[PDB]
Design a protein around this nucleic acid. Structure first.
Length: 187
RNA sequence: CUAAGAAAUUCACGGCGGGCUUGAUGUCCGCGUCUACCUGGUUCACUGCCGUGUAGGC
């Protein structure tokens, strides 16, 4: 979209940058659910996929002026000191097919044992013998702390930038989920 | 090529007993331990679509 807002976090000695990225993402999710718009894209530049750390930048995509003003205010609700955001400028158009989307993994076999026991396959000890073992525990690289709101606990969130094959531009949804679920123009 | 050249000391045994170390004593006075400080990077869970497996929500 043509309403991008790059945000560059100011270096603060008291706070690590991912600890503020989690608060920025939480305020963005809370005030993005609160509006009437449904598909508002979110992209993560400065990605650095060699040292396994998320970037210090963040951009939005919303095909309106009033909606992009609402989301310029939304991620900046109350903080006003740690963001140091920019101005909405006219975007270039390479669009190299890069789609950013959520992924999920299973590292707790006891939840699978609970689901096996108390929902479908009513047993006591067949569950612990049959499938699980202390092996094949997955992992995913970009972490977001993301404390919950509606009676929840601290749970990570993992995201993937897709294939950057520069051949064409396939149309997709702007956002599926909290922030991003589709393709965005990548710079 | 040596004050050279050689060589069986061998046997036995009862050290015994007796005894009052005694009393006496004033260690004793003094004292300033001060000063400063980010545990923090770090709670990958709960429960469900689902016969596995692998999609999703917060």
């Amino acid at each position: 979209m043509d309403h991008y807002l790059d945000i560059r976090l100011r270096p603060d000695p008291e706070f690590p940058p991912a600890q503020l990225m989690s608060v920025l993402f939480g305020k963005l999710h809370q005030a993005l659910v609160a509006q009437g718009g449904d598909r508002i894209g979110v992209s993560f530049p400065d990605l650095d996929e060699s040292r396994s750390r998320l970037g210090e930048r963040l951009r939005i995509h919303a095909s309106a002026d009033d909606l992009r003003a609402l989301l310029a205010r939304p991620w900046l609700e109350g903080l006003r000191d740690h963001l140091q955001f920019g101005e909405p400028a006219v975007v270039p158009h390479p669009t190299p097919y890069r789609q950013v989307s959520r992924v999920q993994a299973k590292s707790n076999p006891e939840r699978l044992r609970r689901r096996l026991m108390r929902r479908h396959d009513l047993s006591e000890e067949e569950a612990r013998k049959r499938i699980p073992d202390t092996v094949a525990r997955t992992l995913d690289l970009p972490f977001v702390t993301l404390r919950s709101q509606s009676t929840g606990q601290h749970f990570r969130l993992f995201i993937r930038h897709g294939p950057l094959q520069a051949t064409a531009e396939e149309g997709g949804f702007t956002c599926y989920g909290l922030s991003k679920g589709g393709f965005v123009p990548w710079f």
